[PDB]
Design a protein around this nucleic acid. Sequence first.
RNA 1: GGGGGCCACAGCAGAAGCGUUCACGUCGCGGCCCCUGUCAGCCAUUGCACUCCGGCUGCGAAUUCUGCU
RNA 2: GGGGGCCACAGCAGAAGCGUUCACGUCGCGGCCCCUGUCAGCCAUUGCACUCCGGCUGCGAAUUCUGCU
Lengths: 91, 91
Amino acid sequence: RPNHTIYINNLNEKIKKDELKKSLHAIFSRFGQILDILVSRSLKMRGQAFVIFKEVSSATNALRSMQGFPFYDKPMRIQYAKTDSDIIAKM
Amino acid sequence: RPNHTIYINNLNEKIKKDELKKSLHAIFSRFGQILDILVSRSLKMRGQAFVIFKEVSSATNALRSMQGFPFYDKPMRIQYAKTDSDIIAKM
RNA sequence: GGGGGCCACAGCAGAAGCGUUCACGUCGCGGCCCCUGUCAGCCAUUGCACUCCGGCUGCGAAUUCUGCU
RNA sequence: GGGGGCCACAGCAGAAGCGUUCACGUCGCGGCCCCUGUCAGCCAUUGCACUCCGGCUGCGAAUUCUGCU
Ligand SMILES: [K+]
Ligand SMILES: [K+]
Ligand SMILES: [K+]
């Protein structure tokens, strides 16, 4: 069940928000245009990120190519987001 | 063998040199005048400190009173210094 | 960093030395507390969101002198 | 933050913002590459000194303009 948005967890929770978004953008921008990267460090949402790609093909390539990739010395676990991100559902 | 200088190890190695010196001074100056606090973060000397008291009785009181005291969530391990500090030997 | 409370202290002006600062100028530099943005340490969390928001603890910078009343 | 290399850049005058800053004013805010203070993540280290000094990885302060010539 592919999706425009990939769900990444098992992220290093010590990395700050602005730095985590910039590093996630640096390693995921080669798969295609990124519309947004959503990161929160609250108890519920820490260690996780949502990367919204402009095209589902980019998300599929990113999920297959970056699965288990070490990122701040922790392997990224990548799934498709279970539901459409708000911006995707509105366009 | 009460020495002017107490040797403290099992110290939190993530604490930076200036903060470690100020915090060690806050709890040990209660026991008497401190002549110097020697802290190095090199591989050999990290997690350790030398607190030099002006009088030997202060070092004995500081040792008996602060043995095992939680310090940055690690129990302080205090001994007398095996040899005199350079500044004490020259006095 | 911010906001209050005690206990000092005759006022105003000035010089220098410091503190903060890439540096310079303004500014600030008596003791003890309390509250609070950030930051750090430890604990807890493997969590599917479109969002301020887990807990505890700690850091909370810097004095001499000279005029006038 | 600093030190270098390679290109790009006409002067005067302003407005807003940003960066550095306890906060203002001065100052600074084009691109790429290399080295590096610091900082951060991971790994290793329980160590008796009077001192630069373990390894690897990452970030690398800040502007679009605006008129006149
Ligand atoms: K974790
Ligand atoms: K996160
Ligand atoms: K140390």
